[PDB]
Design a protein around this nucleic acid. Sequence first.
RNA 1: GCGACCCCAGGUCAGGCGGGAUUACCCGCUGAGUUUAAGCAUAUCAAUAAGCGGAGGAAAAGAAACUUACAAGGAUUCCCCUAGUAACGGCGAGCGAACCGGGAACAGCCCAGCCUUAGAAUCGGGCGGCUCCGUCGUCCGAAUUGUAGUCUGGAGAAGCGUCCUCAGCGGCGGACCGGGCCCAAGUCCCCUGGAAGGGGGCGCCGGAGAGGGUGAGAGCCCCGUCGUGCCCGGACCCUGUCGCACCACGAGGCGCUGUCUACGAGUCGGGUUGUUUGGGAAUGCAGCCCAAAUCGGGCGGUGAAUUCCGUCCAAGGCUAAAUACUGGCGAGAGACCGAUAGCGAACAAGUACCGCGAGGGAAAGAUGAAAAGGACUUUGAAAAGAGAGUCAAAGAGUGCUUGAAAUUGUCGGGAGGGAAGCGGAUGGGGGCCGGCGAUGCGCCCCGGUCGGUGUGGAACGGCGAGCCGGUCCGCCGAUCG
RNA 2: CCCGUCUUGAAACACGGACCAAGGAGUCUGACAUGUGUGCGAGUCAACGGGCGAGUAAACCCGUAAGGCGUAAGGAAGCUGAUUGGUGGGAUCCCCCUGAGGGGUGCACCGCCGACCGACCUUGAUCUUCUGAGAAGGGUUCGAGUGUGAGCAUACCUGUCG
RNA 3: GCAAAUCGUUCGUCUGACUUGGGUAUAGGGGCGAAAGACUAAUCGAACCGUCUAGUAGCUGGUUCCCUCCGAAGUUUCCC
RNA 4: GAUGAGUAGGAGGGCGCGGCGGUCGCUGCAAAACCUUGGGCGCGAGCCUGGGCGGAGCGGCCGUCGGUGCAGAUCUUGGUGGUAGUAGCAAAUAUUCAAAUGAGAACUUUGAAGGCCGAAGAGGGGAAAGGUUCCAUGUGAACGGCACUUGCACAUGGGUUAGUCGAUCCUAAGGGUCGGGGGAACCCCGACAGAUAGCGCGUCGCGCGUACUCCGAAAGGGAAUCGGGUUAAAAUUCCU
RNA 5: UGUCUACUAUCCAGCGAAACCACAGCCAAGGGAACGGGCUUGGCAGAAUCAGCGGGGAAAGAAGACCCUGUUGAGCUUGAC
RNA 6: AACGACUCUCGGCAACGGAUAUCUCGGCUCUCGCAUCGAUGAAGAACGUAGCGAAAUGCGAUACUUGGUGUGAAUUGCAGAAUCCCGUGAACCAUCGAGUCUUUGAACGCAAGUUGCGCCCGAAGCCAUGGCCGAGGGCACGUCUGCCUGGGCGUCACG
Lengths: 132, 254
Amino acid sequence: MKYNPRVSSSRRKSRKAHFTAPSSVRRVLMSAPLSSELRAKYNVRSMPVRKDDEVQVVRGTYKGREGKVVQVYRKKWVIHIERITREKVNGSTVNVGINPSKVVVSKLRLDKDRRSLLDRKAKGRAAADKDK
Amino acid sequence: ARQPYAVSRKAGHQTSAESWGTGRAVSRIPRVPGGGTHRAGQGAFGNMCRGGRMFAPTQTWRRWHRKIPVNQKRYAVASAIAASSVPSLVLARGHRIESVPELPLVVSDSVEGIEKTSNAIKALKQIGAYPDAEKAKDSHAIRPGKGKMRNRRYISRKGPLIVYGTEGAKLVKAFRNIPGVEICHVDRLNLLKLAPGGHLGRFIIWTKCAYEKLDAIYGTFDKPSQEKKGYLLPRPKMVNADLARIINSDEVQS
RNA sequence: GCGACCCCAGGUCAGGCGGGAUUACCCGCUGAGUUUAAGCAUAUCAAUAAGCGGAGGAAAAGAAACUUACAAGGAUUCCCCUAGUAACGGCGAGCGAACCGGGAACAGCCCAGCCUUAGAAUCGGGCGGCUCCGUCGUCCGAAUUGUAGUCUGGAGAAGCGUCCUCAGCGGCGGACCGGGCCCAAGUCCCCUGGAAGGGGGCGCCGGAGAGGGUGAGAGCCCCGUCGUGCCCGGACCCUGUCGCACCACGAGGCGCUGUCUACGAGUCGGGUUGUUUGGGAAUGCAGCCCAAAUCGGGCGGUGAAUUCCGUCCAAGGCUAAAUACUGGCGAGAGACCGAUAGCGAACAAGUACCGCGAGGGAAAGAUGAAAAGGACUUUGAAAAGAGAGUCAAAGAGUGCUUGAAAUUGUCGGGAGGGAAGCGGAUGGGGGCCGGCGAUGCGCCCCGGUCGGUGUGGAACGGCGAGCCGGUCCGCCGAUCG
RNA sequence: CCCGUCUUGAAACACGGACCAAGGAGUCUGACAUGUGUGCGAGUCAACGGGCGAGUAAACCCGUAAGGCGUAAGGAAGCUGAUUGGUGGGAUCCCCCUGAGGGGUGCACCGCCGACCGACCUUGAUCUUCUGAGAAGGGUUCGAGUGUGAGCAUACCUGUCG
RNA sequence: GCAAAUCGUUCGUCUGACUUGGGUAUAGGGGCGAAAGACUAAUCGAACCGUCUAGUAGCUGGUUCCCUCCGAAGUUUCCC
RNA sequence: GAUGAGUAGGAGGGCGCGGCGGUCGCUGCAAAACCUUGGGCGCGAGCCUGGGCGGAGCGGCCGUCGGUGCAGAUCUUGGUGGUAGUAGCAAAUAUUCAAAUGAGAACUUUGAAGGCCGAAGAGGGGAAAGGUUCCAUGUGAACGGCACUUGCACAUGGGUUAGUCGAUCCUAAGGGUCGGGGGAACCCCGACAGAUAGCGCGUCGCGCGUACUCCGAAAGGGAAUCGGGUUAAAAUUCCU
RNA sequence: UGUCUACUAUCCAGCGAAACCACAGCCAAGGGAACGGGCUUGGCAGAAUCAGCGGGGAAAGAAGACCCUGUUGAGCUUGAC
RNA sequence: AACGACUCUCGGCAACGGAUAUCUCGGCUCUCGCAUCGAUGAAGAACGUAGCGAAAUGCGAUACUUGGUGUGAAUUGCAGAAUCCCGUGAACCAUCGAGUCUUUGAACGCAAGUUGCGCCCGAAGCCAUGGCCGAGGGCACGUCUGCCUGGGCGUCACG
Ligand SMILES: [K+]
Ligand SMILES: [K+]
Ligand SMILES: [K+]
Ligand SMILES: [K+]
Ligand SMILES: [K+]
Ligand SMILES: [K+]
Ligand SMILES: [K+]
Ligand SMILES: [K+]
Ligand SMILES: [K+]
Ligand SMILES: [K+]
Ligand SMILES: [K+]
Ligand SMILES: [K+]
Ligand SMILES: [K+]
Ligand SMILES: [K+]
Ligand SMILES: [K+]
Ligand SMILES: [K+]
Ligand SMILES: [K+]
Ligand SMILES: [K+]
Ligand SMILES: [K+]
Ligand SMILES: [K+]
Ligand SMILES: [K+]
Ligand SMILES: [K+]
Ligand SMILES: [K+]
Ligand SMILES: [K+]
Ligand SMILES: [K+]
Ligand SMILES: [K+]
Ligand SMILES: [K+]
Ligand SMILES: [K+]
Ligand SMILES: [K+]
Ligand SMILES: [K+]
Ligand SMILES: [K+]
Ligand SMILES: [K+]
Ligand SMILES: [K+]
Ligand SMILES: [Mg+2]
Ligand SMILES: [Mg+2]
Ligand SMILES: [Mg+2]
Ligand SMILES: [Mg+2]
Ligand SMILES: [Mg+2]
Ligand SMILES: [Mg+2]
Ligand SMILES: [Mg+2]
Ligand SMILES: [Mg+2]
Ligand SMILES: [Mg+2]
Ligand SMILES: [Mg+2]
Ligand SMILES: [Mg+2]
Ligand SMILES: [Mg+2]
Ligand SMILES: [Mg+2]
Ligand SMILES: [Mg+2]
Ligand SMILES: [Mg+2]
Ligand SMILES: [Mg+2]
Ligand SMILES: [Mg+2]
Ligand SMILES: [Mg+2]
Ligand SMILES: [Mg+2]
Ligand SMILES: [Mg+2]
Ligand SMILES: [Mg+2]
Ligand SMILES: [Mg+2]
Ligand SMILES: [Mg+2]
Ligand SMILES: [Mg+2]
Ligand SMILES: [Mg+2]
Ligand SMILES: [Mg+2]
Ligand SMILES: [Mg+2]
Ligand SMILES: [Mg+2]
Ligand SMILES: [Mg+2]
Ligand SMILES: [Mg+2]
Ligand SMILES: [Mg+2]
Ligand SMILES: [Mg+2]
Ligand SMILES: [Mg+2]
Ligand SMILES: [Mg+2]
Ligand SMILES: [Mg+2]
Ligand SMILES: [Mg+2]
Ligand SMILES: [Mg+2]
Ligand SMILES: [Mg+2]
Ligand SMILES: [Mg+2]
Ligand SMILES: [Mg+2]
Ligand SMILES: [Mg+2]
Ligand SMILES: [Mg+2]
Ligand SMILES: [Mg+2]
Ligand SMILES: [Mg+2]
Ligand SMILES: [Mg+2]
Ligand SMILES: [Mg+2]
Ligand SMILES: [Mg+2]
Ligand SMILES: [Mg+2]
Ligand SMILES: [Mg+2]
Ligand SMILES: [Mg+2]
Ligand SMILES: [Mg+2]
Ligand SMILES: [Mg+2]
Ligand SMILES: [Mg+2]
Ligand SMILES: [Mg+2]
Ligand SMILES: [Mg+2]
Ligand SMILES: [Mg+2]
Ligand SMILES: [Mg+2]
Ligand SMILES: [Mg+2]
Ligand SMILES: [Mg+2]
Ligand SMILES: [Mg+2]
Ligand SMILES: [Mg+2]
Ligand SMILES: [Mg+2]
Ligand SMILES: [Mg+2]
Ligand SMILES: [Mg+2]
Ligand SMILES: [Mg+2]
Ligand SMILES: [Mg+2]
Ligand SMILES: [Mg+2]
Ligand SMILES: [Mg+2]
Ligand SMILES: [Mg+2]
Ligand SMILES: [Mg+2]
Ligand SMILES: [Mg+2]
Ligand SMILES: [Mg+2]
Ligand SMILES: [Mg+2]
Ligand SMILES: [Mg+2]
Ligand SMILES: [Mg+2]
Ligand SMILES: [Mg+2]
Ligand SMILES: [Mg+2]
Ligand SMILES: [Mg+2]
Ligand SMILES: [Mg+2]
Ligand SMILES: [Mg+2]
Ligand SMILES: [Mg+2]
Ligand SMILES: [Mg+2]
Ligand SMILES: [Mg+2]
Ligand SMILES: [Mg+2]
Ligand SMILES: [Mg+2]
Ligand SMILES: [Mg+2]
Ligand SMILES: [Mg+2]
Ligand SMILES: [Mg+2]
Ligand SMILES: [Mg+2]
Ligand SMILES: [Mg+2]
Ligand SMILES: [Mg+2]
Ligand SMILES: [Mg+2]
Ligand SMILES: [Mg+2]
Ligand SMILES: [Mg+2]
Ligand SMILES: [Mg+2]
Ligand SMILES: [Mg+2]
Ligand SMILES: [Mg+2]
Ligand SMILES: [Mg+2]
């Protein structure tokens, strides 16, 4: 049960906040779990998906497929993964959108900000979860 | 605990509609004036009219609440407390108390010191109350009907009620995450939790301190309560409810 | 003629102020009728709607010219009660307060007048400086037709002595309000399925099983939720603590003192008229007429004179809190509605459209998990059809989820000499129904299989220490079921 | 003979109705009343508010000379304020007797008749502060009175009214 | 109906109290009227728009499921 | 053991709809809704079930609650019939031939012929009013009450050139106002209760000075443009 | 009374409404809310369809404007209050 | 009185229509917090503004945005961009303190069915103190304080 007076348990309000969220907010909502190998390495559970990350699909008809992210289509709440495509009736190839919660990040596109973000995520777990 | 609901006072009357009168081969209901829109000439103001005003519109000053006399409320609570000590009534209400060592179920006060939910569940297993708690979790389901979209998504069966007698006890937060398990202080027992659905026989787990306070809180048949000024337990119209003993007694059968 | 003052005029003179908008609540004015009275005129509807103005986060009210008649209360406001009461009313219909009492809150004050006259001690503006919501200097003005001090009836002035009280800023922290960041646990095995988020199995978190999202009922996939920790900012108020400074001249408090002791006018009040009120020989307000007083004045719910008594001090002003809030901005919630409902408006709705104008004012939500939105062949001028293709599904094909009825076509069965339908009773032809209809039972032996009085243990029971029992295991006997 | 409807009378040459879907009319609230259920009972009522509390619009607790209704009525008012039951029927029970019987018991209810309080009238020994007290004794008068309380809260149907 | 006043033929007047455009003045118990209660935007013996207003109606119409039981009155008195 | 009519009306026991507090369940191995010449139960309101369709929710039971049950109201909104391929297409004299274009021609275009408007026109302009209807090209549908290859429809693009034409200026009936007078105020009167506006001449001074430097005419008054030529569409405006 | 012309009607291609509609549509008498398409007793009665027609459908159009009632109005008048 | 047509009727399928069921970024109701429009030009109205837009939303000739800060890699229907990536850094992102903010409107030079009719100041530039040109701004009414210039025998005083 929640106790924060600033937090609403209304179904109507939750859905409106999710589907009207700005692009910056949608980045956090479009998070994917790290692989068991990366979780033990960085001590981090989840990370927002990035354009150049490598992920593996763990759910859906494309379960087991592995590839590199090529587009984070935040407006559609999906990501596009290289080689994860289907053929149209006319024979053209179109990428299939996949929800980031249904994939696992195998390799991270590290950068100056990404590394700093990893430290902050691990800092809380190393203290609030272990030292307590 | 109900919140009032009512339609808007102006609903269905935001219109200058007037009756056309008779002589035009149509009913005398008031109609929207003007033209150049489908709305023109349509009926209005009628409870039988599309877009009209409902019959007897609901008002906020409906008498929502009820004040039952305090003595009757105390009578109901005492009956509910007494019913919780009868295993037949507790079973009849749907509680699984087949493995409970005894009713009333009184446990050591050390349970009040439990802080972790994992330790709270182990306490339920030891005293045999876990199966009833497990029933509540397994009954978790979505509410049928329109209630699910009214912020009443989930329903479940009631689990055991734990009564404690120490203010600020830490078990209030160790047990609260367990579905179906309710925690209440002995000094402020609530009928809605003692007889949920108006049905007697709630499964109650008493702490030792809470159990020992019942005489002081509710008094006895001889002396009055210490915390309910001038209150005495009610008497029944029948001292012995065992008809077989009375009917088959030597005095009657002679 | 030259000067001072007075009144007035001009100025795109220097620097300021005002108008309008909003409607939920608030203040002032103005002001109906429908209606009720079973007619109707007083009354009622109503001191209301409409009309015209003025404000704020609250407004208004407010420190007694009060309540009361008691053993007295003690600004205002608000709640309960007083009470549907006293009263008012074609005493009809109806209407209708207040004090006491119990609570919420709590706060008190400022002027005008006799009183600097050894000093207008006051204030504004220009210019300059500083530690700049201010302060200092200088200059020019305002003002004696009176600025500032002192005083406000609870007092007070003056004198006397008791020797009691009174003089700032800064540093840090807390409290208060707002925001930001990290942080629990499975996506393990089997089955179904287009998809597992379903079922079964095995685990885990829980101060987190609120809620939402993700291809079906997801605590453990994702965002959050619980609880800490860390960081940033706003208020300058309140509060804790520290440092520095800390002149009682004066002023106040207390005590006494012969004396002094100033308090609001065309206002109070009265007559009259209108209106209003529960206010009734007149509750308030307003117009006109009359018009005060200072050991006095107002009130004391029956007009008047007379004698007392109680009570307060109007005609000047400010003031937080408790209270209100269908507007605005932000937030939480619901036994509410679920697209003819709910706001008129779930959508490019006060929109399209109508009216010269004031105004009037709709209809209209849902493919799929994903457009994967139907390539290509063939027929046709084209729309399009046929075949094929995508999809779990086109029996989901861009107003496409589900797809009822009225009504229509077609195929099949049947009937029909100016209605048809309907009740009851059979029949013909259809359609449908194997719980629509059984096949066992008893006694024999052949075989197979499975268990059997009396003593030992195990866990219990009925009746109330003791009697009375069954179940299960084992061992003998018995040798049947 | 076609339903619905008003009607003494409808198949009517009385009115509404071409057909289908959906919407569509004794409700909410205040006051009172009878009845019934429940709690307590000469009391009853947590109602404004306070203390709190499911981290909480609930539940729980609080009436200290609070307040409402009831506990006493009559009178316009000044005022005064219940001396506390008799009898005919009657339920139940007890005794005798075994009858349409006889005794004891006599609730509820009804009939009848006194007494008591008050308005009105009447009455006055004996006292007193001169207008009061009250020994005795009253009444074809009047009362929504008394003669060992029955109310208060609450739920709901029905009815009157706004 | 071409038309919520039109069409055909036939008719009145046609230098005048003549016909007509634009500008301008008069607004609802008011205007304007060589007067018909005419006209005042297809509305006039009191326009139109919104509101009071869900105005009141002893009068008309309607008033939604099933069985079971009991079961009427059109008569009295008073009342604009 | 007796007994059975019922309008108006009363009451009892039940059926059904949607929530809430409880409780017992069902469901992608197919919920709700809907369909059925399947079957059954109840006097009945209704209920249970087979099959089909559909593709994600639902039900029983106890208590409690309500915007809870329709054939009617010249009921409301929406939809749909019979009427009916019916009434109807008829004023303004009228068309015909050939060829071109086109899938398609009584209806488009060209040519020829025969008619009509007959200068108070069915011709050539403009003021109001409209607002792109103007011009070119193209065109699936819809629309143009038959049809269309057509266009005042639809789509794309193009088009309005002024010292001399007007507005602008002036004043008319009148309108809006200062001050003043009224008015609770919205507003009323309107130069009528008043230190007008300023102008002229010198170079800041003299002189003059009767309370509006306002609005009000695309037909009143009024400074000045004429031929010739030019575009798919503009001209007294462009060119000379 | 006859006849002549044009445009309709009429037939066709194309296009294509509305009023109205309880259910419906052959009569005689009877009874009946006293004037029936339906009921009683009789006459009778044979698919589908075309052009006309005004007897009937007490045909349609409109909650009678006449008259009366209501404790409804409104315009106007006066010696009504 | 067959067959077939017609009418009626029953069933299957196909039409017509949009009921029902399941939904919902909406409505309604209750409660809570906050006090913030305008001559420093508001509310409202108009016009304009994007590589491809009409509307809605946003914005103002810096015109679906500039700047700062935060976040840290998109926007997306298409096109295009050695714009941008261990970063002075993507975004139709968030937020706000810098800055821009057309014509109007209480609306203020006078007016208005007019982009109509006036007056004043004036940077920059330029031709020889003057002249042209001109960015931009100013000129309503009432009223307060102060100030300047004035009027009247209004009341005086002195020549
Ligand atoms: K100064
Ligand atoms: K979920
Ligand atoms: K004084
Ligand atoms: K008066
Ligand atoms: K006095
Ligand atoms: K609507
Ligand atoms: K489908
Ligand atoms: K059929
Ligand atoms: K009727
Ligand atoms: K009748
Ligand atoms: K009829
Ligand atoms: K009491
Ligand atoms: K109390
Ligand atoms: K009396
Ligand atoms: K003529
Ligand atoms: K009028
Ligand atoms: K009547
Ligand atoms: K249930
Ligand atoms: K069935
Ligand atoms: K229910
Ligand atoms: K023109
Ligand atoms: K010009
Ligand atoms: K002109
Ligand atoms: K002239
Ligand atoms: K020329
Ligand atoms: K035809
Ligand atoms: K007859
Ligand atoms: K009239
Ligand atoms: K057939
Ligand atoms: K629905
Ligand atoms: K502006
Ligand atoms: K920005
Ligand atoms: K002008
Ligand atoms: Mg009709
Ligand atoms: Mg409505
Ligand atoms: Mg349902
Ligand atoms: Mg100035
Ligand atoms: Mg009346
Ligand atoms: Mg009446
Ligand atoms: Mg009347
Ligand atoms: Mg008003
Ligand atoms: Mg104002
Ligand atoms: Mg304000
Ligand atoms: Mg306040
Ligand atoms: Mg105030
Ligand atoms: Mg005072
Ligand atoms: Mg007071
Ligand atoms: Mg009372
Ligand atoms: Mg009143
Ligand atoms: Mg008061
Ligand atoms: Mg009080
Ligand atoms: Mg002074
Ligand atoms: Mg002093
Ligand atoms: Mg003194
Ligand atoms: Mg599992
Ligand atoms: Mg699904
Ligand atoms: Mg998580
Ligand atoms: Mg937290
Ligand atoms: Mg005074
Ligand atoms: Mg007076
Ligand atoms: Mg008045
Ligand atoms: Mg004040
Ligand atoms: Mg508010
Ligand atoms: Mg709607
Ligand atoms: Mg619905
Ligand atoms: Mg679906
Ligand atoms: Mg469909
Ligand atoms: Mg059908
Ligand atoms: Mg009759
Ligand atoms: Mg009938
Ligand atoms: Mg007849
Ligand atoms: Mg009738
Ligand atoms: Mg009819
Ligand atoms: Mg219905
Ligand atoms: Mg009762
Ligand atoms: Mg008391
Ligand atoms: Mg007396
Ligand atoms: Mg007496
Ligand atoms: Mg014609
Ligand atoms: Mg007038
Ligand atoms: Mg005339
Ligand atoms: Mg006449
Ligand atoms: Mg009207
Ligand atoms: Mg009504
Ligand atoms: Mg009478
Ligand atoms: Mg019967
Ligand atoms: Mg249901
Ligand atoms: Mg059928
Ligand atoms: Mg059911
Ligand atoms: Mg409801
Ligand atoms: Mg209803
Ligand atoms: Mg219906
Ligand atoms: Mg009916
Ligand atoms: Mg109808
Ligand atoms: Mg209709
Ligand atoms: Mg039709
Ligand atoms: Mg025809
Ligand atoms: Mg014709
Ligand atoms: Mg013809
Ligand atoms: Mg012709
Ligand atoms: Mg032709
Ligand atoms: Mg001719
Ligand atoms: Mg000719
Ligand atoms: Mg001529
Ligand atoms: Mg056509
Ligand atoms: Mg053209
Ligand atoms: Mg066009
Ligand atoms: Mg000219
Ligand atoms: Mg003039
Ligand atoms: Mg004016
Ligand atoms: Mg003036
Ligand atoms: Mg003059
Ligand atoms: Mg001029
Ligand atoms: Mg002019
Ligand atoms: Mg001219
Ligand atoms: Mg031209
Ligand atoms: Mg006949
Ligand atoms: Mg007939
Ligand atoms: Mg016959
Ligand atoms: Mg025939
Ligand atoms: Mg005819
Ligand atoms: Mg006829
Ligand atoms: Mg008829
Ligand atoms: Mg009538
Ligand atoms: Mg009529
Ligand atoms: Mg009447
Ligand atoms: Mg009468
Ligand atoms: Mg009248
Ligand atoms: Mg935008
Ligand atoms: Mg202006
Ligand atoms: Mg302009």
